[PDB]
């Protein structure tokens, strides 16, 4: 298992597609332990047409979504390594989300960095927690539990 | 007590494709709100969530509850006032106790049921559930703060 | 009932022109009752019209045509995703359509279509679109199913 | 007064993206007729779903384009070219009849609308005509629309 | 063939919405020149931001369209209308030169691309020409590309 | 006149809007001399749906467009400073483009940095040239001339 993955690799693992694939690159990854990835934030995103007119703010719920997708990548690869064929038959689902706190608004030009740690894992059930950071500062925190389920 | 999309557009700053509340059916000031958003396949999000399997994002369900809550907090204090609305902004500080029980898909009428757990000054804590045909599909608690637009 | 997943297996229409979310009633060579949810979160409303969201009358008719198409596909070959994937649908004629009430975000647009006549791939249906029990529009139409 | 471009169209019709289906007006006779057109390109969002690997301009949108052409005719015949008055107007479809599609419209076609006023009284205009591509009739249609103040 | 429609273009070029900027090919002389076009309509997403109340087809997209035309020419010159082989090739555009915009392009215009092979040495193709609206030259440019395995 | 401008400032000067506003932040600016700005590249951009399927590559022509907008921002603030009032009475027109080279493909996760200097300028006619960089490497080179004109 490598520690750096690019969008081409992410596309082979996550089922999310435009406009809900919110992870552009993975900078570090340790199986069963953690992942660090990020998503570039640019004004050229449809979401900003409505959030908000003349005041582009990246939706906090999307930051959370981005952290979850990062965790899902971590969970899957921790169990099957980089296996596109098996990834195509699995799907990660949100079970719970807790202790979410938004500290600083994310805006175009920002590099939204995800830092997720594995708090507990048993089979298909994974509990991760961490933060979203921009230039070293914590812009958000969250905890969530997800399940790796059958796509069919 | 009932507000249609045109009323909603005058209170909330959210616009396409992030305005996730279509109509308000019930509203008791300082108390509660019941509103909903129709889910249809003809929504852009379904192009990627997911291909060949349309499922309304759980985080967007939470977003819809937040918008309902902010509408509740705002109108409780100032009523239906478009003018004042433009001078205030309701952003969310925290979200907790979120649980997803059932997937939401095209054809569903996603109903938001939020109540005021507590409030002090401009800090408002709301909580409740998201329902589809009488069943709880999600639950969450959120804390918002009302401030002056920049 | 037939849900979006099933509708997708029969109708060739896709985003942003798939305007039927669920099929509630189906009677081969007789009639069909289906619907589409209308929400503000649809791109069409950016232009129809700004600050005044009104689902386009022509799209209501389109939705009725699609509902009629599903009835045609299934009356002809039953629920067969394999045959469906080779066909598409063409509008042939539209007539006697009248709009009575504007459809807007938050409405459940219900299609009610019955077959007036059919032969081969050519199907003629007519009926109404309803919101909460009221007729918001009436229309008759004829469409042709064909090989891609 | 007889030829208008997209700038002029945007100042009269209330429709906007992705529902403004008239690009240019080539000839206009007050209270009588109008000829306009819309270019059809693959680079339009409707083609993502109508259909996949077979782009066909929706018949219902051709009608919409004809109605919009009639709407422009109706408005200017009423108040002349007055953007300030047009700003707060809307256009509702009332009826559609005798429409027949003969030839599919595809990317690369110049969809030309030819509308003639069949009857009009106040805000209610009843127009009828055809949609053409390269001089051939691809569609026929009759429709009645009402111009209304945004209230 | 000499005339190709959108369904033919889709099988040769990898570009898809919103970056397929060639609607039809009207003329094609293997290794010599190509004449094709793209209709410009207000119903295109790019006009939402370029520019509000002043729809002007981006000059850079006119060049992109000219580049796509050159690519189709190069490819068809090498293998003809072969959808299967098309899936295994890519045309990287290396440079762009001598571009000049003389007249703005707007909704309602039929943007016609006129390109001819300037030089072909190995995997390198050099094309140049103009874009025209109703007989008038609206833009001109030179471009060089390299053919390679996808 | 300051040297750093964020998206809300760019919105008040450039007339470009979604999906054609392709500068996110200004990091350095010297009036009538040069400018350094950048646009974050993310998978969550509509353009990637067609360029290309299963292989996101930011269009070379859009990179040039981005450099042009940066130039236009420098040009305008050079003649009128940060003036939103006069900014809304103008648009920019591409006149020519020359010496364009595409050396490295740009992909999601990249921070596309624009480096432009003024080659010549008189009245509303500005001629700039420079590079587009990612992690300090030259991804593209270009020269272009633009004109600021009255919206009329
Ligand atoms: C520290 C912080 C966190 C946030 O999530 C927001 C803001 C600030 C914020 O100021 C803000 C303003 C606004 O107009 C809309 C928002 O969604 C917001 C915010 O969401
Ligand atoms: C037959 C064929 C195969 C290709 O891969 C391309 C093209 C044509 C092509 O025309 C083309 C044009 C272009 O501007 C960029 C491209 O990447 C391309 C292509 O990649
Ligand atoms: Cl937010
Ligand atoms: Cl979800
Ligand atoms: Cl209508
Ligand atoms: Cl059709
Ligand atoms: Cl330009
Ligand atoms: Cl490119």
Author numbering:
A (entry chain A), F (entry chain D): 8 to 159
B (entry chain B): 10 to 159
C (entry chain F): 11 to 158
D (entry chain E): 9 to 159
E (entry chain C): 9 to 158
Task: Copy text from the publication.
FabZ is an important enzyme responsible for elongation cycle of both saturated and unsaturated fatty acid biosynthesis in FAS II pathway that is essential for membrane formation in bacteria, and it has been recognized as an attractive target for antibacterial drug discovery. Two L-shaped substrate-binding tunnels with the entrance protected by a door residue Tyr100 were located in the interface of a dimer and ~20 Å away from each other. The catalytic site in the tunnel was formed by two highly conserved residues, His58 and Glu72' that were located in the middle kink of the tunnel.
Emodin was discovered as the inhibitor of HpFabZ by IC50 value of 9.7 ± 1.0 μM and further inhibition mode characterization suggested that it functioned as a competitive HpFabZ inhibitor with Ki value of 1.9 ± 0.3 μM. Emodin inhibited HpFabZ activity by either binding to Tyr100 or embedding into the middle of the tunnel C appropriately with favorable shape of complementary, thus preventing the substrate from accessing the active site. Different from the open and close conformations, the phenol ring of door residue Tyr100 flopped ~120° to a third conformation and paralleled the pyrrolidine ring of Pro112'. Ring A of Emodin was then stacked between the phenol ring and pyrrolidine ring forming a sandwich structure, while 3'-methyl of ring A also interacted with residues Arg110 and Ile111 via hydrophobic interactions. Apart from the interactions between ring A and residues near the tunnel entrance, ring C of Emodin also formed Vander Waals interactions with residues Phe59' and Ile98, and was stabilized in the right place by the hydrogen bond interaction between 6'-hydroxyl of ring C and water molecule 466 which formed H-bond to Oε2 of Glu159. In the other binding model (designated hereinafter as model B in Fig. 4C), Emodin entered into the middle of the tunnel C near the catalytic site, and located in the hydrophobic pocket consisting of residues Ile20, Leu21, Pro22, His23, Gly79, Phe83, Ile98, Val99 and Phe101. Ring A extended to the bottom of the tunnel and was stacked between residues Pro22 and Ile98, ring B interacted with residue Val99, while ring C bound to residues His23 and Phe101 through hydrophobic interactions. Additional hydrophobic interactions between 3'-methyl of ring A and residues Ile20 and Phe83, and hydrogen bond interactions between 6'-hydroxyl of ring C and water molecules of W12 and W402 which formed H-bonds to Oε1 and Oε2 of Glu72 respectively stabilized Emodin in the right place.
